[PDB]
Ligand binder design. Structure first.
Ligand SMILES: CCCCCCCCCCCCCCCCCC(=O)OC[C@H](COP(=O)([O-])OCC[N+](C)(C)C)OC(=O)CCCCCCCCCCCCCCCCC
Ligand SMILES: CCCCCCCCCCCCCCCCCC(=O)OC[C@H](COP(=O)([O-])OCC[N+](C)(C)C)OC(=O)CCCCCCCCCCCCCCCCC
Ligand SMILES: CCCCCCCCCCCCCCCCCC(=O)OC[C@H](COP(=O)(O)OCCN)OC(=O)CCCCCCCCCCCCCCCCC
Ligand SMILES: CCCCCCCCCCCCCCCCCC(=O)O[C@@H](COC(=O)CCCCCCCCCCCCCCC)COP(=O)(O)OC[C@H](O)CO
Ligand SMILES: CCCCCCCCCCC[C@H](O)CC(=O)SCCNC(=O)CCNC(=O)[C@H](O)C(C)(C)COP(=O)(O)O
Lengths: 173, 459, 57, 172, 75, 99, 86, 606, 64
């Protein structure tokens, strides 16, 4: 197709062998056969003519990379230039992590429909995967406000190990 | 900008020196053309706001408003050109001068980069509007209405001016960028409390908020149609644009202080829509309808969550195009019957068949069916408000239930009924009216396909 | 075809698009004033093209 | 105006009979109970005292009001009826035709020409109706809601335009 | 026994409806043809790796050719 | 009399003079040009051509790029056996917590 | 269905009155005023219009009903109400 | 990925073609209704195909397509979900809407806007189709509001009828109260589960959705016209007969019950809310049926009979029987739609007479229409091996063999017996008796369109109960071993209901004088519901709007506190500071004080 | 026309401040506003105190 199974795991199909014991013909074979010979075949014929027409004049496009830049943890206070470079990179990291959750949601939705009735247990691995994504995404970006910024993200982050330091020190006793 | 501001300014000498009768033609030509040019700014980059010069910049919030204002400019021209065709050439030229000037301030305000520059032009919009409502108004209460509109806006704006210059002396520059990247924690203190109140009240009055809203039923109803749109379709959102920008610094004091405003808007929006349930003037019906929608924007801003800001801009743009439409609708009847009472002209679908259809989609857009942009805005706020508090869905939905009754109420009272016997001057709708109405609703339904353009700066 | 009349009533039409040209011109008259850090952001810092004078105008 | 007693009792008979229609249903039951209703009305017909007549009415109106069918049968072409103003939404006033485009005006030359004759006839007779009114106004303004007819020849009845040219009850 | 049908004049409304069908489609079909013609003759681009020396100047980082053309000029 | 003013003259039936009247002004010829300009410079080029421009704009607020940046990050992270996205936002090793 | 026409109404009009046993068949002039010659009680005409009310499927309001007193009148009012114009 | 994906999706695209074709006016204005009907017929026959692979392969589809917006971490986009409930509902809905569209030609053969009316019907069908075929909750809301507004126009189709707008206003009013819970579930399913697609919601396993399901239930009550929100269905009879026969019989009011069917897997986890569903269905069944029997208009009787049916369906949903409800959906869809244009045929023939009193003598006067009525009435009862049996008494047997809410079980048994009760009233007064209509009889059902429309649906009531039950895969828990006595109570209560209702109806034949029972009064004016409901809170809310709200608070108080008081304050001393008497002595004396107070008294020196 | 005047303009000039109007202004006005303030503030205090301790869990709630 146009992707890889490692990003969208679709377990290999399991199709049965249709062997109708009853002598009366199966109609569903007939409407499928006429559909191929009346609709599907002209569609394929037009598509291949379209594909070769595209192949004659091939113009290419590439993908834009953004080289890693210093983030806001090493950004000097009131350094407006490093403020901008850090803020833009963090928001770009925000967009990709939003898409990371987007991918996991698609896999989970595929987990439901593909299993149908057996959605509960067949791909609970999808459920725990989304559990790890959503929980970590909660402490990573959630509750940052409509004016979220890399300074705010550190502020929320700093609250975690500060609370964690108190807990573990209490735990060590 | 310079690429939109300069053509806008250059329309001013063009209309003044235009031909005697070609004023309406040429002004409509290029105002549509300038709107086409402003479609270029609908694109926004990844996260950094589109910056052109030091004084002018755009983001994924200003540009959706910029196109709305410049697209509006042709609409006021055709709507007003009905009655304005019966006065002196200079008087008509003076009007087109004033709409062009009024639009000019709106374009420059929305792309202002310095908060002081924002405030100067934000308040400067009063002068073109104030003269519109007063000089060319068609009633007697306009004289009191103009004073109410001017004084309410100014009484709130003046504390902002004192507050704004205070930020300049203390923090430094007030550029919308340097403010964002140098946000400092506004700690809870009585001086900060009034700092918060001053920077907020100015934009609240122009929303308007429940209680600081009595200027709207006077200003909007008495204003001429070329004005009756802008006081409801763009410059109410101008107060909205002020809120979403000024709240960059007002954290975290906003959540502690937002409670009086939330309760006033969240409870008052039920009362305001209750006024619409029993009204006598069609213009007042839509006017109070605007208050309910803007009140929903008022609460939306203050949670300061990604979903709320999106639904804020979505409703903000959609309501403006909607509320502008209904004012065109009330204008058509008000010209034919020369009165604003609802029950006077009951029965229009019998006589005007397509006018009912335009009224149907107009009242439907206010009804906010899915996937209309009104619904895509209100629904987003409901989810954001519900996450803030579960109880608010009782109030949020109650308006959604209440807004159905009145939004279809003028549909029943005016269109769906026996035609009034005594009235005999109803004429087949001019192709200007129908063309204008299509210019309102066609972009709205077309916008439904791609809400990303108008979804705000957080998509 | 009585060109005087055309330039009497339609000389006003050209007045706007030249303003738009002026608007574009001033935008490209101003942007180079904001040059400062041109190809200086380390994200977009890249070795200049060989037979090309400079990066983004 | 003042509804006299003999009219009001007739209104009771008409309405009460229509109410037992919703009760009796079957025709033979109707004709029986109607005759008892009819004669029970006629048995008390020599009351020289008009006060006693209202005293007889003092229990009849409450008798109707509690014996009334909660879903009385009313013909659809009437208030409460299922077909009340059902075809009203096509009653386009005739004066709207004056706004038709000439292409549509020329589509029906005969009817439009006759419409002109009626319009010319209405124009001529309007002032004739006008002076007819003040020629026979009652001293002190119009006393009754009624409307006097055309007394002389060649005069249309006063205030005839809307009544005569009203849309048909079945316009479609 | 057929008779007249007094109805509101819809000719001007018919004019308005017909005109959009003539005006909104005057540039409607040519762009609709242009959108389809572009997608089938010049076609849609395909993903390719970054060349050794060629940086993708501005408009290159886009799939659709007409979308690339808008990126070429304008922005 | 009190005041000497002409009363409300009338509401001029714009359809009466030209039966095909357009509702823009009195003079027919310029009024005929008035739809020819509002329709042409309206629906045609700012509604149809306007829609195609905005609807087919170069991708706004890059998402399919961000959608692109997802697969190689997750593919790299899941293949070598590392949690696909860390709980901490910014690197915590260089954080110097107070005391 | 063809519209209810004037000749159709009147033929249906004296259809009901002659079907009334209180009226002799012979004395049935189309303009025979109910009180004058037939001499039926003032309650009776109120009960005959109900049969006419059911006959044509309509309503005769009491305001007009009490004045309606001729077979010509009954066909007149019904014809005028249901736009009968031959 | 068979043709089952593409071919089932194009069914909607075939349906929406007439809507686009209408504005171009290429259609011949004479034969537009024929254009609509054969278009739906083509879609119907095209919609048969999704069935054949459903029984054969047992496969279901989820068709997602063009992305709407990548809003944060949710992917709101157009998407369709073919499944057991979907792939068969469209063939039933298309078959029903095809039959009525054929019938609508004969009935509405005089409405001047007939092209507009058929345009509205197709638009409703499109909105209903996307309602039954929706993957995200937002898309479900598109239909959930599309059918509601489409009902509003179609109910007020006759336009000028003053009370029709009230019912049209009533229909949207009760719907909006239903949508209260819909938007509540929307917000909850987006906040606590970060989605609106049904796939994610089920995977996330929100095992305790107390408030969502409560909001989910409230959505059904407004749309399915349950108790507390029923009366808009009886008032919807003010619309034309085909209008209610399509929308308010088997294709629009079904939305409410259908919503729970979509969220059935999440239904079983909760126990409190599901009891409320069977509780709400129980009261809805009786009260609608209790008001059904004592009504004297044919349209009202069928309306209350419908609302009694949907009350029964939610009773099934209560005790973990969602799919059996969908079986009840299809079986109820066939015959109930039939009964409406059987009533429509007699109503039009009897010069628009709908009052059940001015009827009678139609069994031999209208043979086919009477024949269809008996078939439809018997389906309401559930005669064995007929369409009614394959759903209804299976539920009654199912509800008996369950841990029900005692008092909830009894009401349905009283209700199902009550179903026969008003059924006799329809057959008794309208057909079995002596004629009572106006003298000029215009009875005629010989029109081919009327015969063909009823004939097509009538064979669907003799059959298709056995056909569907056998064809659908066996996937419900079978109640095999019950004690005999309650196994056939459904036949007992109907026969018992048949016997006494006939005797009481025939009691009217007895010349005995009638006494108005106060219990009969309570039933006849719809449980006193409309006059308290539709008069008291409407007055109170509107009263609060005028004396308060608009007046008092606004226009008096809010204008006299901030704006006018400041004007008065600025004014009271304005009269003062501008009334200097002009005497030089007073001016210079004020100078003395101003000099004196400033120099030393204010300590301005230091 | 008189009715529109009576409902729109001839109200405040004919308004007379009395304890009945004054009390109704407070009861129908500031009253419910504080009522909703108390209800919402208590819920926010309830919610805020609960997730601080760790009572409510939003392991899957991310968008807000
Ligand atoms: C076969 C079908 C083809 C369909 C093509 C797609 C639809 C095309 C729709 C065109 C109208 C909508 C876009 C209007 C763009 C207006 C110009 C703009 O945004 O900025 C000015 C633009 C950009 O501003 P600039 O000139 O400062 O840009 C400098 C950078 N370069 C030179 C690389 C572009 O001006 C120009 O590009 C100058 C050339 C003339 C442009 C004339 C535009 C109006 C007429 C079209
Ligand atoms: C491949 C391309 C196929 C042809 C596409 C043609 C267009 C189309 O249908 O696109 C579908 C695409 C679908 O995107 P997609 O992600 O499905 O990808 C497209 C390709 N297919 C469909 C094959 C997968 O959506 C859009 O383009 C959005 C259309 C939005 C239109 C908005 C018009 C606004 C007009 C405003 C006028 C007024 C302005 C002033 C006022 C502004 C408001 C205040
Ligand atoms: C265990 C199994 C029990 C099964 C019980 C079945 C009961 C079926 C219904 C019987 C009562 C209704 C009935 O018979 O209705 C038909 C009829 C209508 O009479 P009416 O509307 O007055 O019209 C007369 C016109 N001349 O005659 C009537 O008498 C109408 C009576 C109206 C009131 C009926 C009240 C029924 C209450 C049932 C229980 C409700 C819950 C308690
Ligand atoms: C028409 C009535 C008002 C309508 C509503 C307006 C908005 C409500 C708030 C009103 C006050 C607005 C003025 C705010 C000025 C700038 C606020 C600001 O930035 O905060 C300062 C705080 O502002 C103030 O102190 C002044 C504002 C508080 C209110 C007192 C003056 C305004 C009220 C009276 C005049 C207006 C009322 C109308 C009178 C006719 C911080 O400075 P500081 O106090 O910390 O100074 C440093 C140090 O601590 C000591 O100075
Ligand atoms: C079956 C179930 C029924 C359920 C419903 C039952 C409805 C109520 C039944 C009881 C009715 C009651 O007995 C009578 C009453 O209403 S009031 C007194 C009548 N007494 C007069 O009116 C004397 C004066 N006379 C005249 O007014 C004229 O003479 C008259 C118009 C009568 C005849 O005109 P001529 O001829 O004179």
């Amino acid at each position: 197709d146009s992707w890889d199974k490692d990003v969208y795991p679709e377990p290999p199909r399991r199709t049965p062998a249709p062997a109708p014991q009853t002598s009366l013909p199966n109609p569903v074979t007939y409407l499928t056969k006429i559909f191929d010979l009346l609709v599907d075949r002209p569609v394929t014929l037009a598509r291949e003519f379209i594909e070769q027409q595209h192949a004659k004049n091939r113009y290419y496009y590439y993908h834009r990379e953004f080289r890693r830049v210093p983030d806001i943890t090493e950004c000097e206070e009131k350094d407006i230039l490093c403020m901008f470079e850090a803020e833009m990179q963090w928001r770009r990291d925000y967009k990709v992590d939003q898409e990371i959750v987007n991918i996991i949601q698609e896999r989970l939705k595929a987990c439901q429909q593909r299993e149908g009735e057996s959605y509960r247990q067949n791909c609970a691995k999808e459920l725990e995967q989304f559990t790890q994504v959503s929980k970590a995404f909660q402490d990573r970006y959630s509750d940052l406000g409509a004016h979220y910024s890399a300074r705010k993200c550190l502020a929320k982050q700093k609250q975690r190990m500060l609370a964690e330091r108190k807990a573990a020190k209490e735990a060590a006793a | 900008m310079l690429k939109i501001i300069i053509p806008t300014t250059m329309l001013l000498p063009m209309t003044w020196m235009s031909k005697h009768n070609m004023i309406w033609i040429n002004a409509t030509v290029h105002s549509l053309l300038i709107s086409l040019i402003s479609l270029s700014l609908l694109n926004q980059l990844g996260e950094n706001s589109l910056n052109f010069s030091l004084t002018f910049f755009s983001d994924s919030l200003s540009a959706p408003l910029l196109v709305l204002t410049t697209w509006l400019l042709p609409l006021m021209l055709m709507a007003s050109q009905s009655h304005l065709s019966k006065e002196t050439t200079t008087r008509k030229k003076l009007y087109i001068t004033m709409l062009i000037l009024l639009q000019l301030f709106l374009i420059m305000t929305f792309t202002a980069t310095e908060l002081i520059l924002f405030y100067i032009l934000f308040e400067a919009t009063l002068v073109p509007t104030l003269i519109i409502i007063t000089r060319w108004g068609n009633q007697t209460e306009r004289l009191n209405a103009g004073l109410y509109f001017l004084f309410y806006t100014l009484a709130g704006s003046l504390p902002l001016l004192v507050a704004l210059v205070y930020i300049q002396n203390t923090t430094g520059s007030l550029n919308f960028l340097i403010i964002h990247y140098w946000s400092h924690p506004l700690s809870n203190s009585w001086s900060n409390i009034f700092m918060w109140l001053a920077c907020i009240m100015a934009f609240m009055v122009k929303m308007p908020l429940y209680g600081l809203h009595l200027w709207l039923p006077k200003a909007h109803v008495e204003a001429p149609i070329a004005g009756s749109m802008v006081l409801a379709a763009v410059l109410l959102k101008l107060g909205g644009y002020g809120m979403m920008r000024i709240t960059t610094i007002l954290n975290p004091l906003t959540n502690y202080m937002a409670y009086p405003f939330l309760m006033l808007s969240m409870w008052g929006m039920i009362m305001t829509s209750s006024i619409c349930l029993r009204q006598t003037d069609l213009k007042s019906l839509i006017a109070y309808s605007s208050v309910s929608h803007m009140a929903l924007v008022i609460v939306a801003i203050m949670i300061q969550t990604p979903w709320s800001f999106m639904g804020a801009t979505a409703l903000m743009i959609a309501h403006g195009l909607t509320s502008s439409m209904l004012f065109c609708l009330a204008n058509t009847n008000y010209e034919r019957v020369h009165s604003r009472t609802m029950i006077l002209a009951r029965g229009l679908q019998t006589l005007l068949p397509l006018m009912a259809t335009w009224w149907l989609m107009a009242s439907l857009t206010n009804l906010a069916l899915p996937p209309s942009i009104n619904l895509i805005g209100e629904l987003f706020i409901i989810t954001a408000s519900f996450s803030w508090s579960n109880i608010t869905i009782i109030l949020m939905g109650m308006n959604m239930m209440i807004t159905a009754l009145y939004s279809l109420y003028m549909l029943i009272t005016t269109q769906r009924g026996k035609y009034t016997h005594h009235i005999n001057n109803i004429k087949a709708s001019f192709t200007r009216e129908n063309a204008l109405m299509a210019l309102h609703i066609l972009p709205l339904l077309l916008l439904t396909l791609n809400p990303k353009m108008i979804l705000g700066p957080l998509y | 075809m009585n060109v005087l009349q055309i330039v009497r009533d339609h000389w006003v039409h050209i007045l706007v698009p030249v303003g738009f040209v002026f608007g574009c011109y001033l935008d490209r008259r101003s942007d180079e004033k904001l040059t400062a850090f041109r190809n200086k952001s380390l994200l977009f810092k890249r070795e200049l093209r060989p037979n090309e004078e400079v990066t983004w105008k | 105006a003042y509804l006299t007693h003999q009219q009001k009792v007739l209104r009771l008979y008409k309405r009460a009979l229509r109410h037992l229609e919703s009760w009796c249903v079957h025709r033979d039951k109707y004709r029986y109970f109607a005759c008892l209703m009819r004669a029970r009305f006629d048995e008390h017909k020599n009351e020289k005292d008009m006060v006693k007549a209202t005293q007889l009415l003092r229990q009849a109106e409450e008798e109707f009001w509690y014996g009334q069918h909660p879903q009385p049968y009313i013909f659809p072409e009437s208030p409460g009826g299922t077909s009340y103003e059902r075809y009203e939404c096509y009653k386009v006033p005739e004066w709207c035709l004056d706004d038709w485009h000439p292409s549509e005006k020329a589509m029906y030359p005969d009817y439009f020409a006759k419409r002109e004759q009626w319009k010319r006839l209405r124009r001529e007779s309007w002032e004739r109706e006008v002076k007819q009114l003040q020629e026979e106004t009652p001293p002190g303004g119009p006393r009754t809601e009624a409307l006097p007819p055309a007394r002389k020849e060649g005069d249309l009845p006063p205030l005839w335009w809307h009544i005569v040219t009203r849309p048909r009850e079945r316009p479609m | 026994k057929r008779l007249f049908i007094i109805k509101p004049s819809g000719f001007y409304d018919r004019r308005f409806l017909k005109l959009m069908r003539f005006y909104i489609l005057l540039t409607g079909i040519p762009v609709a043809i242009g959108i389809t013609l572009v997608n089938v003759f010049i076609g849609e681009a395909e993903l390719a790796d970054i060349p050794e020396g060629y940086v993708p100047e501005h408009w290159e980082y886009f799939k659709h050719p007409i979308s690339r053309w808008i990126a070429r000029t304008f922005y | 009399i009190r005041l000497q003013e002409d009363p409300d003259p009338e509401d001029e039936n714009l359809y009466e003079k030209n039966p095909d009247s357009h509702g823009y002004d009195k003079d027919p010829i310029v009024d005929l040009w008035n739809m020819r300009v509002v329709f042409f410079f309206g629906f045609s080029i700012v509604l149809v051509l306007g829609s195609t421009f905005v609807a087919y704009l170069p991708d706004y607020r890059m998402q399919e790029w961000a959608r692109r940046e997802a697969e190689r990050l997750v593919k790299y992270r899941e293949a070598n056996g590392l949690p696909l996205m860390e709980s901490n936002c910014f690197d915590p090793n260089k954080i110097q917590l107070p005391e | 269905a063809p519209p209810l026409t004037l000749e159709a109404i009147k033929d249906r009009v004296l259809y009901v009155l002659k079907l009334y046993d209180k009226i002799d068949p012979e004395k049935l002039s189309v303009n025979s005023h109910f009180m004058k010659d037939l001499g039926l009680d003032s309650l009776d005409q109120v009960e005959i219009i109900m049969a006419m009310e059911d006959e044509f499927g309509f309503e005769i309001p009491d305001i007009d009903a009490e004045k309606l007193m001729c077979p010509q009148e009954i066909v007149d009012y019904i014809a005028d109400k249901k736009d009968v114009y031959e | 990925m068979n043709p089952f994906a593409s071919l089932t999706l194009t069914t909607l695209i075939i349906l929406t073609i007439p809507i686009m074709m209408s504005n171009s006016n290429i259609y011949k204005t004479n034969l537009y209704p024929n254009y609509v009907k054969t278009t739906v017929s083509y879609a119907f026959t095209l919609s048969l195909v999704p069935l054949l692979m459903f029984m054969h392969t047992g496969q279901e589809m989820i068709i997602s397509n063009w992305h709407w917006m990548t809003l944060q971490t949710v992917e709101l986009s157009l998407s369709f979900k073919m499944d057991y409930f979907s792939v068969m509902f469209i063939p039933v809905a298309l078959f029903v809407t095809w039959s009525i569209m054929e019938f609508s030609m004969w009935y509405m053969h005089s409405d001047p806007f007939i092209n507009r009316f058929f345009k509205y019907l197709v638009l409703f069908l499109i909105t209903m189709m996307i309602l039954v075929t929706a993957n995200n909750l937002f898309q479900l809301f598109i239909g959930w509001e599309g059918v509601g507004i489409m009902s509003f126009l179609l109910i007020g189709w006759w336009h000028g009828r003053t009370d029709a707008n009230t019912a049209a206003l009533q229909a949207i009013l009760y719907n909006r109260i239903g949508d209260i819970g819909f938007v509540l579930s929307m917000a909850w399913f987006l906040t606590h589960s970060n989605a609106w697609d049904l796939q994610q919601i089920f995977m996330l396993n929100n095992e305790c959705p107390n408030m969502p399901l409560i909001g989910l239930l409230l959505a059904a009550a407004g749309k399915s016209a349950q108790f507390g929100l029923h009366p808009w269905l009886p008032s919807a009879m003010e619309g034309p007969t085909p209008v209610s026969a399509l929308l308010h019989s088997s294709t629009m009011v079904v939305a409410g019950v259908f919503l729970l069917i979509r969220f059935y897997p999440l239904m079983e986890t909760n126990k409190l809310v599901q009891t409320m569903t069977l509780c709400l269905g129980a009261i809805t069944t009786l009260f609608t049926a209790l008001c059904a029997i004592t009504q004297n208009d044919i349209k009202k009787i069928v309306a209350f009979s419908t609302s009694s049916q949907l009350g029964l369906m939610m009773v099934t949903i209560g005790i973990n029987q969602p799919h059996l409800a969908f079986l009840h959906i299809c079986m109820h869809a066939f015959f109930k739609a039939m009964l409406f244009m059987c009533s429509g045929s007699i109503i039009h023939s009897l010069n628009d007479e709908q009052d059940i009193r001015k009827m009678g003598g139609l069994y031999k006067a209208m043979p086919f229409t009477t024949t269809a009525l008996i078939i439809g009435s018997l389906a309401l009862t559930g005669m064995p091996y007929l369409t009614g049996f394959y759903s209804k008494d299976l539920i009654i047997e199912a509800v008996n063999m369950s841990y029900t809410n005692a008092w909830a079980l009894l009401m349905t048994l009283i209700a199902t017996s009550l179903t026969a009760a008003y059924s006799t009233r329809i057959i008794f007064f309208a057909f079995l008796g002596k004629p009572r209509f106006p003298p000029l009889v215009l009875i005629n059902e010989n029109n081919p369109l009327l015969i063909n429309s009823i004939k097509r649906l009538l064979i669907g009531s003799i059959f298709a109960g056995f056909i569907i039950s056998n064809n659908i895969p066996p996937m419900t828990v079978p109640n095999t071993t019950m004690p005999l006595y309650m196994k056939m109570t459904a036949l007992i209560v109907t026969i018992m209901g048949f016997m006494l209702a006939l005797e009481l109806n025939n009691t009217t034949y007895y010349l005995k004088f009638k006494y108005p029972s106060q219990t009969y009064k309570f039933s006849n004016m719809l449980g006193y519901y409309p006059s308290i409901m539709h008069r008291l809170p409407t007055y109170h809310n509107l009263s609060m709007s005028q004396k308060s709200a608009s007046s008092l608070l606004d226009l008096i108080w809010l204008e006299t506190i901030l704006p006018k008081t400041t004007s008065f304050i600025q004014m009271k001393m304005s009269i003062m500071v501008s009334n200097q008497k002009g005497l030089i002595k007073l001016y210079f004396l004020s100078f003395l004080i101003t000099i004196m107070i400033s120099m030393t008294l204010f300590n301005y020196h230091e | 026309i008189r009715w529109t005047y009576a409902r729109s303009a001839n109200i405040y000039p004919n308004f007379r401040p009395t304890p009945k109007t004054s009390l109704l202004g407070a009861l129908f006005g500031i009253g419910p506003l504080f009522f909703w303030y108390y209800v919402f503030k208590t819920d926010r205090d309830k919610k805020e105190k609960l997730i601080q301790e760790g009572k409510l869990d939003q392991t899957f709630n991310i968008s807000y």
